[PDB]
């Protein structure tokens, strides 16, 4: 006998369901920040399912990252076989958006595109062509394909970090960095976490366990959110302010901490500009050029309380390192070239309080005060808990207690997100958050700091990406700033009267003085637009302006996609891109320190091609078109670059070296210090930890936390002052009233009664998986907008009724979900459902303009300059206001 039990033979039916002949590595190349390792199971050449591989190496004493994954990821293979899939090259036959197509060969489709590209260069300008493809970390080879193509023909690229509102503007203003954040395992090292406009139960699904685990291990967690969000059911305390009033809350916390002397004075004196001396006459920093002949406009003073004399702090913009290093993309300047210990406080004792006299170059005596003295006086005057309680609706007692707890627990951390970053004035709010963190002195400590999480913006091996995407140098690449590009070319009405904020004047002056770019140059229209790896049109702010005003300027719109998204639906040519499980690419994120990847489980389906192979094929047909049109070489005076379109394919591949996808990916790994030594074969087997990181060392067995090269090794911060700089003494900051962190009330230019919130949902990754049938079956079959019962009932609105939301920018009609946890006075529409889904008109972006904050346009103040994804106007949208009413054309009964 076999030993088998009575029904073992019949049970083979179920055993066969869990079987496969092939197992390969997979990843989901979507902008979720998960970068979750997966296996893909196939049988007879058909992918059956995927499952988390659960193979990130653990660190001692703290929970492992495994398994990661989420509800979209475990049905990711639905997009291989589903009704959305692009099988063949498609060319529009109807009007844009109708979904009337003809199938075309690759040859005809690429020839059409190639012919138009050459014509546009020949007849207009290369900068009338652009390529939008965001978040390189999600899929860096696929990103590099279109960018390298643009790189060699002179087309311009876009920005994404700021256009999305994810760029921590206030952090770049404070710290002189593009951005940085701890990996999420470091959350477990904190004793006290504030979740501030962040909903990780829904928006950090594979990482959320660290929070409940930290709590069971003795940490306390606070949630600050107007609505009772899904994350808040686990926290120890919930603070629910009015929307967009968080700055008032942060400044009152700063008040309590300063007044009650709960701050870390040593840290302030060494690591911030809060001892730097400010002239009482001009309100500017006292500078060396004021005091000394030929003195520097970029060196400053503090008052040394040990000697009773003014002293010039080391490390500021005018102080050079003796050994200059090369520029580093994520730093205002390469302060790593300074030696360790450079800004160590030594036996200095900078005064934080007092008034002092100093003698200028022209004899006269000026009163100077330390920044901290100015800040302190204003905070005592205007930012009491009692005053902030009136603005925020949070009790003064609660504000005070939060401030005390946050400053007392060590380490404490702020985790911020879209709820605090997607506002017009989010820059000054994040400065306030950084002020709270600097006062408690937790920057650069495990379990501490001001850690922002948003999208999948950070590729640690960025130098290898740049090498593949922009081989002749980023200084030889055209970039627009996409918020500006959209605002201008879509001819947006932001409803902000110029006598309140002269947006137009600031923007125009930004451009004509060269602080911010404007593409195309000389006022030409954009003409050709490549969109791929982003649903640019569906997610665009100002979408109704875009569709009416920008789209018709474009002569040719190409979408490359795995599926028919809304952008593709509104495109001229749609090219089938291979699914994540039919291609090779890398996949990384800021949330964990490991390199993920996908590889082909099977060959590209139907006639699809990988993104790398598509732009290689297009390169060949552009060569041919340039020949036919006798326009193969042309002078691009902007870069002193004689371009040769007849050799575009060899340019794309380095004479064929990088003609295979895998070699392109290996080229990235080889050309970054964070990854050199790692091979694809290693990554195929197991995810590999980065070898180094950005602004701190990456230590074996320890979670990354940023900025230790400044906090611990005492290199200067890459700011004008050389510190965490809370005083920005630029005209535009004075104009807007934010030379110091302070409360800026939200924009109320939309004259309508409900604030419009558009948070991110557990049920999709942006627009991707919105239309997935399983995801919809786990909701109510379509998009949702949420309302409090206290607003719905007076309007006659019942749960699951259709509601109409509108303002001057557009209107949307969507089914409502009445949720008691929603705060009265606001509605919450999960962002950017696809236009073709269960909406009677419009979508979330119909009601959103494009708005530009003038502080984000400053490009001539030390570390404030334009660099793509380093600084630029955020595409905020949480200030929007709408009205809501019941839609009465369809009122189905419930049962």
């Amino acid at each position: 006998i076999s030993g088998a039990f009575e029904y073992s033979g019949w049970e083979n039916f179920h055993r066969t369901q869990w079987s496969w002949d092939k197992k390969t590595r997979g990843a989901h190349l979507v902008n979720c920040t998960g970068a979750c390792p997966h296996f893909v199971y196939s049988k007879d050449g058909v992918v059956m399912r995927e499952e988390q591989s659960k193979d990130i190496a653990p660190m001692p004493n703290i929970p492992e990252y495994n398994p990661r994954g989420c509800n979209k990821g475990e049905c990711g293979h639905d997009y291989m076989y589903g009704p959305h899939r692009i099988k063949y090259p498609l060319i529009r036959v109807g009007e844009r958006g109708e979904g009337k197509w003809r199938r075309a060969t690759w040859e005809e489709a690429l020839d059409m595109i190639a012919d138009k590209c050459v014509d546009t260069i020949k007849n207009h300008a290369p900068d009338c062509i652009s390529v939008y493809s965001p978040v390189p970390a999600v899929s860096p080879v696929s990103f590099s394909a279109g960018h390298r193509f643009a790189h060699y023909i002179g087309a311009h690229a876009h920005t994404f970090y700021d256009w999305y509102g994810d760029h921590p503007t206030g952090q770049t203003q404070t710290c002189g960095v593009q951005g940085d954040t701890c990996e999420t395992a470091d959350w477990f090292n904190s004793k006290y976490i504030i979740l501030w406009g962040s909903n990780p139960t829904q928006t950090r699904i594979p990482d959320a366990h660290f929070l409940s685990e930290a709590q069971l291990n003795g940490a306390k967690i606070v949630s600050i959110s107007p609505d009772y969000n899904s994350s808040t059911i686990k926290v120890d305390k919930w603070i629910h302010p009015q929307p967009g009033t968080d700055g008032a809350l942060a400044m009152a916390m700063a008040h309590v901490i300063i007044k009650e002397k709960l701050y870390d004075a040593h840290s302030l004196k060494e690591q911030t500009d809060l001892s730097y001396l400010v002239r009482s006459d001009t309100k500017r920093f006292l500078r060396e050029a004021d005091v000394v002949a030929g003195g520097s406009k970029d060196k400053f003073y503090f008052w040394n309380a040990k000697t009773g004399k003014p002293v010039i702090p080391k490390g500021s913009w005018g102080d050079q390192p003796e050994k200059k290093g090369s520029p580093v993309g994520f730093l205002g300047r390469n302060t790593f070239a300074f030696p360790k210990g450079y800004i160590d406080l030594g036996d200095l004792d900078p005064a934080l309080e007092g008034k002092f006299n100093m003698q200028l170059l022209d004899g006269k005596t000026v009163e100077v005060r330390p920044v901290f003295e100015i800040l302190k006086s204003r905070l005592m005057a205007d930012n009491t808990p009692e005053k902030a309680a009136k603005i925020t609706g949070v009790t003064a007692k609660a504000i005070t207690e939060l401030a005390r707890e946050f400053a007392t627990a060590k380490p404490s951390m702020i985790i911020c997100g879209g709820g605090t970053q997607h506002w017009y004035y989010s820059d000054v709010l994040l400065r306030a958050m950084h002020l709270l963190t600097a006062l408690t002195g937790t920057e650069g400590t495990n379990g501490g700091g001001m850690n922002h999480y948003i999208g999948q913006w950070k590729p640690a091996f960025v130098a290898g990406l740049v090498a593949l995407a922009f081989p002749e140098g980023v200084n030889k690449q055209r970039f627009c700033q996409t918020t500006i590009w959209t605002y201008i070319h879509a001819e947006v009405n932001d409803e902000i009267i110029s006598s309140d904020i002269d947006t137009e004047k600031y923007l125009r002056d930004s451009i004509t003085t060269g602080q911010m770019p404007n593409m195309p140059e000389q006022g030409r229209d954009p003409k050709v637009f490549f969109v791929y790896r982003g649903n640019w049109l569906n997610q665009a702010k100002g979408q109704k302006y875009v569709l009416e005003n920008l789209w018709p300027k474009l002569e040719l719109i190409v979408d490359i996609n795995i599926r028919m998204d809304s952008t593709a639906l509104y495109s001229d040519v749609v090219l089938p891109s291979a699914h994540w499980y039919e291609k090779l690419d890398l996949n990384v994120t800021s949330e964990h320190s490991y390199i993920n990847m996908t590889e082909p489980a099977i060959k590209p389906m139907w006639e699809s091609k990988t993104d790398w192979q598509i732009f290689l094929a297009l390169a060949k047909r552009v060569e041919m078109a340039a020949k036919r049109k006798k326009y193969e070489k042309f002078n691009d005076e902007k870069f002193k670059w004689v371009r040769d379109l007849s050799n575009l394919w060899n340019q794309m591949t380095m004479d064929g070296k990088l003609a295979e996808d895998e070699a392109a990916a290996q080229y990235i790994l080889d050309n970054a210090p964070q990854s050199k030594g790692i091979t694809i074969q290693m990554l195929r087997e197991k995810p590999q930890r980065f070898k180094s990181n950005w602004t701190s060392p990456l230590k074996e067995g320890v979670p990354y936390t940023p900025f230790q090269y400044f906090v611990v090794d005492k290199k200067p911060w890459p700011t004008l002052t050389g510190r965490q700089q809370f005083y920005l003494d630029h005209d535009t900051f004075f104009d807007m009233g934010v030379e110091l962190p302070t409360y800026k009330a939200p924009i109320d230019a939309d004259k309508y009664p409900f604030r419009f919130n558009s948070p991110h949902s557990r049920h999709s990754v942006h627009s991707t998986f919105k239309d997935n049938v399983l995801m919809l079956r786990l909701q109510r079959g379509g998009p949702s907008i949420e309302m409090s019962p206290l607003d719905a009932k007076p309007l006659g609105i019942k749960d699951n009724d259709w509601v109409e939301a509108w303002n001057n920018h557009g209107k949307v009609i969507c089914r409502v979900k009445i949720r008691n946890g929603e705060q009265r006075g606001r509605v919450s529409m999960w962002h950017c459902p696809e236009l073709y889904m269960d909406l009677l008109t419009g979508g979330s972006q119909s009601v959103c303009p494009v708005r530009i904050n003038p502080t984000n346009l400053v490009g001539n103040y030390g570390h404030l300059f334009f660099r793509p994804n380093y600084y630029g106007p955020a595409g905020s949208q949480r200030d929007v206001r709408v009205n809501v009413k019941r839609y009465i054309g369809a009122t189905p009964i419930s049962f």
Binding site: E74, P83, W101, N217, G218, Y228, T395, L778, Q779
Partner: protein
């Protein structure tokens, strides 16, 4: 039916479930992709309080009353939810006008009332309740079946519907008080959770455990004194079965939520009471809840003071293999 040699045992930590539905999706894409199974979610996750799946399942009837088998209702299809269907082809590829609406007109679905819960702002409250077959020690489905098509495996205590022996009597559906057998109208057979016995047989945790992203799921044999399920059910005694009054002796247990904020009083200041009412948890898990929450609170408070707590460390689960049968596959 006779006791099994070992009993596969689950623990669900409601302090850690994030309601992401990954487990719901994993089970469905593994076991219920076949004809007639579209409306079947062997694993499902419902917001509590709420109607659950199927709607109002908690008053469906079934189980045992003073040891006597109860015959409950058979839920109508609308209470499970007609699985929405969509015509993407027409709009996206065939030039048809008109939004890609769900069919039918939405009125019910397995997760219809997600995140609604109960209570008025600022004391609205809800949490997540994952559910599956409880592979009961007293399976009412098994006794009910007039064709002895349901059996309880001797090697691991997993309850299985034998698809050849089933004739579609639907007594199991009537008698399971958890509503976890689903009648398949295409095949005329009940289908339900198989405890992932094919994975268990190869030493791999069930998909709803191995793929749990919140890291809230435990599994093992309750006879293994070094397993987390033993420690939570038998040693520390903080894991309770769902609706014990149904009399089926479930082998799935729940650690009740002790995380969560306080009730907020009219002046904006906190009460000592939690937003999750004890009365709700008692409705789910019985009169032992109070004492469990006290243990949990006391042990968490040790951790807050920098002291050791073996129980907190069990729930934290710094290594997944301290919570479950190996999840690697």
């Amino acid at each position: 039916m006779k006791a099994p040699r070992r009993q596969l045992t689950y623990v669900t930590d409601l302090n850690k479930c994030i309601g992401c539905q990954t487990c719901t999706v994993a089970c469905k894409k593994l076991w219920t992709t076949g004809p007639g199974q579209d409306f079947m979610y062997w694993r499902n996750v419902e917001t509590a309080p709420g109607l659950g799946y199927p709607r109002n399942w908690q008053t469906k009837g079934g189980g045992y009353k003073n040891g006597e088998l109860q015959k409950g209702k058979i839920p109508p299809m609308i209470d499970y939810g007609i699985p929405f269907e969509f015509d993407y082809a027409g709009r996206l590829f065939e030039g048809k006008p008109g939004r890609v609406r769900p069919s039918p007109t939405p009125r019910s679905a397995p997760n219809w009332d997600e995140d609604q819960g109960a209570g008025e702002y600022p004391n609205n409250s809800f949490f997540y309740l994952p559910r599956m077959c409880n592979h009961c020690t007293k399976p009412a489905c098994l006794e009910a079946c007039p064709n002895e098509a349901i059996y309880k495996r001797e090697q691991d205590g997993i309850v299985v519907i034998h698809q050849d022996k089933c004739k579609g009597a639907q007594a199991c559906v009537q008698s399971c008080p958890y509503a976890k057998p689903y009648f398949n109208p295409l095949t005329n057979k009940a289908n339900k959770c198989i405890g992932c016995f094919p994975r268990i047989e190869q030493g791999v945790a069930p998909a709803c455990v191995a793929q749990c992203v919140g890291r809230a799921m435990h599994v093992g044999f309750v006879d293994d004194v070094n397993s987390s399920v033993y420690k939570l059910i038998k040693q520390y005694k903080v894991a309770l079965p769902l609706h014990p009054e149904f009399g089926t002796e479930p082998n799935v247990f729940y650690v009740p939520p002790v995380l969560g904020p306080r009730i907020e009083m009219a002046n904006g200041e906190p009460s000592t009471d939690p937003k999750i009412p004890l009365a709700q948890l008692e409705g789910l898990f019985g009169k032992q809840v109070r004492d469990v929450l006290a243990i949990l609170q006391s042990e968490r408070e040790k951790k807050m003071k920098g002291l050791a707590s073996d129980l907190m460390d069990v729930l934290i689960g710094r290594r997944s293999t301290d919570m479950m049968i190996s999840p690697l596959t």
